[PDB]
């Protein structure tokens, strides 16, 4: 049964949510009017995971769109499949945060969250057997990073046992578009580590790297970037919606991937990806799927895994394929590249099979891996943050809204402590 409600915040979050719901609706054969038009029975088999039913035979997603400015929602509503969303679920402020963490975390988010917490509780209470929650947002903006995290803190108090997923868009150093990236990003992670069950890291720089060189597109837009992200996000919960050889829900991924409670930052990659010109020259077999699984350029993060060692890895196959080939390749890669795998935990790769491939494809790949090479993200964010904080730059805005400069310190140290112990397991030997 195991349904999940969608929670998404900020303009970065909203634009990702718009593409994701389009993909699922097309996957389940839902028209822009919200009426089923499919042909197979299995498309309606497990639709209760995402869609709620109303009178007249129409379906409505159980998503909550949340923001501090009404401009974004008035744009996302008019888009394709934008009439599906129930108008009541839209919640927005009238002032905005202005890329300031304190405005979105102490002043405006605190008073606004009373309304949005009411609607989400109604959504959770309606379903008989809730499975968990998933999040989509960015850490670079105050409204996304501040009121998004404070939402996480409150909801964890009411459902401590339910699973929780978060997609984080951390600011990459090269293509940086705001000056206050290190402040809000550092502070958000401090609250993120204590409450989030899982975290997926997504860098727009990495997405730009993949599209330009793999698909070879001259002029991509954010829609193309949003298309890639939605493909992976659907893959994680795909086999929860379709029968397969080996079932694997959200809880199974968590227990089989994180060895320790404070290590829940991942990196994802989607395969296969091929340009239109090279689309007709490849062959879709398991070796090609698994060879692009672990390839460095395909990761959705700027962190190269060859600078560290994988702790645990997971893979989700979609389609009909022989099980032996799936397991054979996992043992194959885990042997030829023993330098990149930690030694004290043998057989640190997990596999799953889903019988329904994505539309337009025959076989698919969804990879989620916990590697110690992503610490360089926090290491570089730390050095910009201490560059900001040593000279007390842009601080009077933050300290002028009810908080002191002390809270900056322990969040810096807690993130600093995280890096040290996260690096400890890299050189640990048994």
């Amino acid at each position: 049964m195991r349904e999940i409600v969608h929670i998404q915040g900020g303009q970065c979050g909203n634009q990702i949510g718009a593409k994701f719901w389009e993909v699922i609706s097309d996957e389940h054969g839902i028209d822009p009017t919200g009426t089923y038009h499919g042909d197979s029975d299995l498309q309606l088999e497990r639709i209760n995971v995402y869609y709620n039913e109303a009178t007249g035979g129409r379906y409505v997603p159980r998503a909550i769109l949340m923001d501090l400015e009404p401009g974004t929602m008035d744009s996302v509503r008019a888009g394709p499949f934008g009439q599906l969303f129930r108008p009541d679920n839209f919640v927005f402020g009238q002032t905005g945060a202005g890329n300031n963490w304190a405005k979105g975390h102490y002043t405006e988010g605190a008073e606004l969250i009373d309304s949005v917490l009411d609607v989400v509780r109604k959504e959770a209470e309606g379903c008989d057997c809730l499975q968990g929650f998933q999040i989509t947002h960015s850490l670079g903006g105050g409204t996304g990073s501040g009121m998004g995290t404070l939402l996480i803190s409150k909801v964890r108090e009411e459902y401590p046992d339910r699973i929780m997923e978060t997609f984080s868009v951390v600011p990459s150093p090269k293509v940086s578009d705001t000056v206050v990236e290190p402040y809000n990003a550092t502070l958000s992670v401090h609250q993120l580590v204590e409450n989030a069950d899982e975290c997926m890291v997504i860098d727009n720089e990495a997405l730009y790297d993949i599209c330009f060189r793999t698909l070879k597109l001259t002029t991509p837009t954010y829609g193309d970037l949003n298309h890639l992200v939605s493909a992976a996000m659907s893959g994680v919960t795909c086999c929860l919606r379709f029968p397969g050889q080996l079932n694997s829900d959200l809880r199974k991924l968590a227990v089989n991937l994180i060895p320790f409670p404070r290590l829940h930052f991942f990196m994802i990659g989607f395969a296969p990806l091929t340009s239109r010109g090279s689309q007709q020259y490849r062959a879709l077999t398991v070796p090609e799927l698994t060879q692009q699984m672990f390839d460095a350029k395909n990761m959705m993060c700027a962190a190269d895994p060859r600078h560290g060692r994988y702790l645990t890895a997971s893979a989700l196959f979609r389609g009909r394929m022989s099980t032996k080939e799936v397991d054979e390749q996992m043992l194959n890669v885990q042997n030829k590249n023993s330098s990149y795998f930690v030694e004290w935990i043998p057989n640190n790769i997990k596999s799953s099979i889903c019988d329904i491939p994505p539309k337009g494809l025959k076989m698919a790949v969804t990879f989620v891996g916990n590697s110690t090479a992503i610490q360089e993200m926090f290491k570089r964010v730390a050095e910009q943050f201490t560059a900001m904080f040593r000279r007390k730059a842009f601080l009077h805005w933050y300290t002028g809204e009810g908080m002191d400069e002390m809270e900056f310190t322990e969040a810096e140290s807690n993130m600093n402590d995280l890096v040290s112990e996260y690096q400890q397991y890299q050189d640990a030997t048994a």
């Binding site: 049964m1 195991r2 497990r46 057997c129 029968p243 050889q245 080996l246 079932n247 829900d249 809880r251 199974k252 968590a254 227990v255 089989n256 991937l257 060895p259 320790f260 409670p261 645990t312 394929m321 022989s322 099980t323 032996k324 080939e325 397991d327 054979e328 996992m330 043992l331 004290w344 935990i345 043998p346 057989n347 640190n348 790769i349 997990k350 596999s351 640990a428 048994a430």
Partner: protein
């Protein structure tokens, strides 16, 4: 007048059980909907289906099986399949939350709310039977609910019925290729529970069956469905003597009276022969002399254990088809003479021989061809001590740094349960070297 009750838990249990029952329905002529055909209008003959099926009084038959699981996806597919009309609607028990590869979740938190339903269901199946031989259980030990509920059910079944026989078919994790990452924990913890609660256990390691299909059946890309048909064949030859007339009858009770020298030692590994494809099945005579040589061939072992590394305790094999008792005795004499196969010192005679008349059936859409002769063998050996050694090696590696322990402590299982589980395995091992030494 003799019945056996099949118990299936976990996704591996359901998929294995699914392949077994299509064989049984075809073996006895049962249509998927329950009636024999709609064509035969005589009926009322040769009641042998009572071992597995049960008449409703007029018409259809209902299997004496139960399906247990915690995620409904696998069970729901059964209810929408072509066999929807066969099973009783309320013996396919399905949970709400999966154990998620967690032994503690399937043993202390979720399984308690569903174990009550099964025992009530089992009690209603047992009351119907009059000559119940025993229970069969199928479980994938590497999964959370497979070892979780399996541990709970066997403990409860031990006191509810007492001396009633229970037979176990475990599927142990493969030595080097595995599905999940946390399998050493829930597999090791399972052994402590089932060691003092099962009567007979059989290893059904996956990669060994992968070798058989590739080498013999010539399949380069097999799936779990091809495997499940071989284990279903083993079950057929195992209980064929119960419902089919033969020269020598071997019942269920004849195994826990002939095969386990000591109460602690009841772990065995099986073989099946011949396994040959239709295009090359007819190029050789398939003489009974050579089929029994293939069974003892360690390359065709159904578990990744080499008996040449240890001694043999006892050997039980069942023949079916048109075998001749004197031919069977002739081949056994050669096996004893063979030097590379040795028996333990204190076992001068170590063979149990059963003969059945019904040849193995052939399933359309299957993989094996139909032959006049086949043999299924169950062997007990000291070579089964190595699998616990490698599990101890892997278990100790990540338990030194207490990896994943938080995934078990917070669900109600105290820390000390790992320490006692380790000691029992060490004590269980020490038994195996103690027995294997000569006087």
């Amino acid at each position: 007048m003799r019945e056996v009750i099949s118990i299936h838990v976990g996704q591996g249990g359901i998929q294995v059980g699914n392949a077994c029952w299509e064989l049984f329905c075809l073996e006895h002529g049962i249509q998927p909907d329950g009636q024999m055909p709609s064509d035969r209008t005589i009926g009322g003959g040769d009641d042998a289906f009572n071992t597995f099926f049960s008449e409703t009084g007029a018409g259809k038959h209902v299997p004496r099986a139960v399906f247990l699981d915690l995620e409904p996806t696998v069970i729901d597919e059964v209810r929408t399949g072509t066999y929807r009309q066969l099973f009783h609607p309320e013996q396919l028990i399905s949970g709400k939350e999966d154990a998620a590869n967690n032994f503690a979740r399937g043993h202390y938190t979720i399984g308690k709310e569903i174990v009550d339903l099964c025992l009530d269901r089992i009690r209603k199946l047992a009351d119907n039977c009059t000559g119940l031989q025993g229970f069969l259980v199928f479980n994938s030990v590497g999964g959370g609910t497979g070892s979780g509920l399996g541990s709970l059910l066997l403990e409860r079944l031990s006191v509810d019925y007492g001396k009633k026989s229970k037979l176990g078919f475990t599927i142990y994790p493969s030595p080097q290729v595995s599905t999940a990452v946390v399998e050493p924990y829930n597999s090791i913890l399972s052994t402590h529970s089932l060691l003092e609660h099962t009567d007979v256990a059989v290893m059904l390691d996956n990669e060994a069956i992968y070798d058989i299909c590739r080498r013999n059946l010539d399949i380069e890309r097999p799936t779990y469905t091809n495997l499940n048909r071989l284990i279903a064949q083993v079950i057929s030859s195992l209980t064929a003597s119960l419902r089919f007339d033969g020269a020598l009858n071997v019942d269920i009770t004849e195994f826990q009276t002939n095969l386990v020298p000591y109460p602690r030692i009841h772990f065995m590994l099986s073989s099946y022969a011949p396994i040959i494809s239709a295009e090359k099945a007819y190029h050789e005579q398939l003489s009974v002399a050579e089929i029994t040589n293939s069974a003892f061939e360690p390359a065709n072992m159904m578990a990744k254990c080499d008996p040449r590394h240890g001694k043999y305790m006892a050997c039980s094999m069942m023949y079916r088809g048109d075998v001749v008792p004197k031919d069977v005795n002739a081949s056994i004499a050669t096996i004893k003479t063979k030097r590379t196969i040795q028996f333990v010192d204190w076992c001068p005679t170590g063979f149990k021989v059963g003969i059945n008349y019904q040849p193995p059936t052939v399933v359309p859409g299957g993989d094996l061809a139909k032959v006049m002769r086949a043999v299924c063998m169950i062997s007990n050996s000291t070579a089964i001590a190595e699998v616990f050694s490698r599990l101890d090696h892997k278990f100790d590696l990540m338990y030194a740094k207490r990896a994943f322990v938080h995934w078990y402590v917070g669900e109600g299982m105290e820390e000390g349960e790992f320490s006692e589980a380790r000691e029992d395995l060490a004590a269980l091992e020490k038994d195996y070297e103690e027995v294997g030494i000569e006087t």
